[PDB]
Structure formats: structure tokens, C-alpha cells
């Protein structure tokens, strides 16, 4: 079997990225954020907190023929901006661009924390990460891609996310006509849970390249690219006025500024990311200052490749029994 789901940014800053998800019997569509940093397919529902939702659309078990309550689990989860939920757990079918597991876990929440709510556009993530960081307790669950990965014609999904464009996330297949040239794989330690790499060095706008090795995470679920505080440095001296506001929290720049570009490698190849694709716009309405999409991870205890680097590429995540990452121009 195969899935193929188009994938839609949720505002004009691509701060995240919505894909339908059905689920449940009749389906109920629910707009989810696959998030490859996380393990938990989580969604608001009919036991979340009523002051708690604004405006999502809910899943509701009680009106799904195959909904059945995981008797005892319950989940709970933090993540790495703050942001928290927690609740019950039912099984149901699942199903992302014609690709349906049944019985997969649906985390139903009964609380989330405020941010959640304040984004009436994303009804629940779907976790891509390993199985491993699953949070259900005390049977811990496996995600959509580890309970489809057998029945997949090949044990892999690919994220090709738009810059201000829709993108597609695709299951069990590479589309060989979504990229140029060549994918690179490039090796995967699972040891934390995530798609963890390490990248082969960096060049700013039309720089030469420094090779040095920079272990960090393949994370759609995160916006903006974290790297070292050395790295982000380096990328900044090249914007005339930009500067690190402990105020904001991270570099700002000129809104009126030409931003370079930013390359980073996959073992000898190169992926280059656009200048416009490191602008965040204004801090605030109005504002001059505009906030920059290349952070310092100084402060994380991890680098994350988020969807800043990702949509500059079309990426493999290959589920083999080893596991590796591929990249390639598109």
C-alpha cells in the first residue's frame, strides 16, 4: 500500500504545516500537524476542556463504530517550545491519503495548554518520530507509520514541504519526479528517539563551505533551524543591523534587509536554503524588526533541521531496520 496527503501551511509565515487526517467510522477529518520530532498522535476531542478549545475542529469517540477505549492508558506530553497536553486513549482506523491503519492509538486530550488553544488551525499533531518516545502509559503505542510500515509497498514516508505553498507528505513510495538530481542517505542514530543525523558543515550565502560535523534532528514539527550558536553567528554578521535581543528571544534583523542564503551539507552534498526562507517578518505588527529563521540551539541541548531547512529539501525518512535519512534538491 501507498498514502499521498498534501500537506498546507497554516498562516503566511509557514509557522506550521495542517494535513486531513481521517478518523474513525463514519471518518471525522481532522487538520494535524506531522511532527517527525514527536511519537504521539494526539487530537482534540469531546473530552478536551470545553474553555480549552477555540475553534478546532474535535474528534468525538462516541460517534465512531470502531472507537474502543485502551482501558487505563493515559498520555501525557511536553514539548520542546513549552507547550503541553495530556488525556485518555482510544483505538479506531486511522487513514492519511487513502493509507489506513486500523487500531491505531488516538490520543484524546482532556487538557492541553494555551498555545494549543490559541491555534485554531491545528486540530492534534501526528507524531513521525520512534515508537520509542511514545508517551502512553502503561502500554506504550506505536505510531501511524510504524503500524502501517509493513503493509507499505517500501518502508519509508517523504516530507516535501512548500515555502508559502502547499507541499505533500507520501507513505510507502519516493516520487521520483518531486526532486532533482540525486537523493544523498546519510546514517540515522535512533538512540534519543529521533531521526538524529549529523550534517557534514555549513556555507553562508556565497561563502566557502566549513566542513564540520553537526549532530541535530530531522523535525518537522519545529519551525525555524537551530544550530550552534558559532554557526548562528556566523550567518548573522552577514545582515547588516541584525543582532541577538535577549527581549525577543533570538536574532532579529532589518525588515528591510536582503537576507543570503544558508547551505547546509549531507555528506558531500550541499542543500541551499533561500534567503527568504530565513525571514519570520515583523516581531510584531507594525514592526521593523523582523525575526530571523536561523536560531541558536544554544539553550535546547539539541541542533534541529526544522521546517526552515526541511522545505528546502525533499526528505526520505527510511524506516529499514536500519534506519537513514535521504535528501535532495528539489
Not at 501551511?9 to 514527536?38: E, R
Not at 477555540?54 to 465512531?64: C, F, L, M
Not at 543570503?260 to 542543500?271: D, E, K, L, Q, Y
Request: negative net charge.
Amino acid at each position: 500500500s501507498t498514502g499521498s496527503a498534501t500537506t498546507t501551511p497554516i498562516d503566511s509565515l509557514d509557522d506550521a504545516y495542517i494535513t486531513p487526517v481521517q478518523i474513525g467510522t463514519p471518518a471525522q477529518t481532522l487538520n494535524l500537524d506531522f511532527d517527525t520530532g514527536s511519537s504521539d498522535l494526539w487530537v482534540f476531542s469531546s473530552e478536551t476542556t470545553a474553555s480549552e478549545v477555540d475553534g478546532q475542529t474535535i474528534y468525538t469517540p462516541s460517534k465512531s463504530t470502531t472507537a474502543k477505549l485502551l482501558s487505563g492508558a493515559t498520555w501525557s506530553i511536553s514539548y520542546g517550545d513549552g507547550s503541553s497536553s495530556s488525556g485518555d486513549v482510544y483505538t479506531d482506523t486511522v487513514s492519511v491519503g487513502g493509507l489506513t491503519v486500523t487500531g491505531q492509538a488516538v490520543e484524546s486530550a482532556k487538557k492541553v495548554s494555551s498555545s494549543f488553544t490559541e491555534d485554531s488551525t491545528i486540530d492534534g499533531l501526528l507524531g513521525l518520530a520512534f515508537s520509542t518516545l511514545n508517551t502512553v502509559s502503561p502500554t506504550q503505542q506505536k505510531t501511524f507509520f510504524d503500524n502501517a510500515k509493513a503493509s507499505l509497498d517500501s518502508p519509508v514516508f517523504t516530507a516535501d514541504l512548500g515555502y508559502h505553498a502547499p507541499g505533500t507528505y507520501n507513505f510507502g513510495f519516493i516520487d521520483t519526479t518531486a526532486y532533482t538530481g540525486s537523493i544523498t542517505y546519510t546514517a540515522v542514530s535512533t538512540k534519543q528517539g529521533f531521526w538524529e543525523w549529523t550534517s557534514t558543515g555549513y556555507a553562508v550565502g556565497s561563502g566557502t563551505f566549513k566542513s564540520t560535523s553537526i549532530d541535530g534532528i530531522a523535525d518537522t514539527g519545529t519551525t525555524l533551524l537551530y544550530l550552534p550558536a558559532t554557526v548562528v553567528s556566523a550567518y548573522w554578521a552577514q545582515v547588516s543591523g541584525a543582532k541577538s535581543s535577549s527581549s525577543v528571544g533570538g536574532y532579529v534583523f532589518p525588515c528591510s534587509a536582503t537576507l543570503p542564503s544558508f547551505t547546509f551539507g549531507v555528506g558531500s552534498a550541499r542543500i541551499v536554503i533561500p534567503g527568504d526562507y530565513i525571514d519570520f517578518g515583523p516581531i510584531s505588527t507594525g514592526s521593523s524588526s523582523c525575526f530571523g529563521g536561523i536560531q541558536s540551539s544554544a539553550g535546547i541541548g539539541i541542533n534541529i533541521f526544522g521546517d526552515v531547512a526541511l522545505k528546502a529539501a525533499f526528505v526520505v525518512f527510511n524506516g529499514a531496520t536500519t534506519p537513514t535519512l535521504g535528501f535532495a534538491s528539489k
